[PDB]
Amino acid sequence: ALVPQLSTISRALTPSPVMVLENIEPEIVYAGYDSSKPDTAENLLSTLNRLAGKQMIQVVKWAKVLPGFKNLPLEDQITLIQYSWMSLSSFALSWRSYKHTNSQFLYFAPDLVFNEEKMHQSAMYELCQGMHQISLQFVRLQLTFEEYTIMKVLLLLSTIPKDGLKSQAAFEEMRTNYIKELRKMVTKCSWQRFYQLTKLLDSMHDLVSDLLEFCFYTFRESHALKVEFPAMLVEIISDQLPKVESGNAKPLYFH
């Protein structure tokens, strides 16, 4: 006569966290690249920035439905996103390059694929090589989509403020849960692969530092360099630059 609150049906039908990530993976975004304009550094970079703005809008929508992310306080939900935006951007860039081009090119968007030439023309050739190296690693490792999605969540939880987050305890829980996910995922029916993946995540820090250095530089000199940044990026970079440059961003490592 009393309706049970617990639900055996609901509990069994609930998809795995790995299945939820697959369900919420953002759809590919177009850059709106106009090949009728010359491929100068000013145009290529502005285009990339516009693409970045469109991508971050989807990343935010992704962060709202991310399991466990809602357990953290709002302030720690914005800081983590502003701190890891470059890392998520570069890592998703490598995944698309790997899946869509076998890591032969940098697949920024279906309408914008960089070959060596555009890499030189972009005026950030070495950085492009840096991100392309990660794509090559996806091939040697035969990274799987499941491994990818988990790794991306970890990147979102890879950089925190020096003084700490509002809920450092809640943060530690979520990060631990996802590291577990990757742990059980890399398990054959294992430690060497888990090692290769963790070191891959760690290497993202130095790469991201280099990308950010170029980003902060082009941002402060955008007028002189004529590189346009969309609203979404001005917001993110205006908050991140003074924090990163002041030694207030702490990177988390596995090794």
Give me the residues that bind ligand STR (CB under 6 A), please. 45, 48-49, 51-52, 55, 89-90, 93, 108, 124, 127, 211, 214-215, 218, 227
Least Cα distance to 40 among 174, 216, 227, 192 occurs for 227
Using CB atoms within 10 Å of the CB of residue 155, give its burial: 0 to 12 exposed, 13 to 18 middle, 19+ buried: buried
Least Cα distance to 72 among 163, 179, 168 occurs for 168
Helix axes 125-141, 74-101, angle to 10 degrees: 80
CB 212 to ligand STR: min, Å: 8
Is the CB of 126 or the CB of 163 nearer to ligand STR?
126
Is the CB of 47 or the CB of 77 nearer to ligand STR?
47
Is the CB of 18 or the CB of 84 nearer to ligand STR?
84
Q: Which residues make up each annotated binding site for progesterone?
A: 49, 55, 96, 218
Quote the CA–CA distance of 133 and 136 in Å, as a whole number: 5
CB 254 to ligand STR: min, Å: 22
CB 55 to ligand STR: min, Å: 5
Q: Which residues make up each annotated binding site?
A: 49, 55, 96, 218
**Where is the chain discontinuous (C–N over 2.5 Å), named by the preceding residue?**
189
CB 179 to ligand STR: min, Å: 25
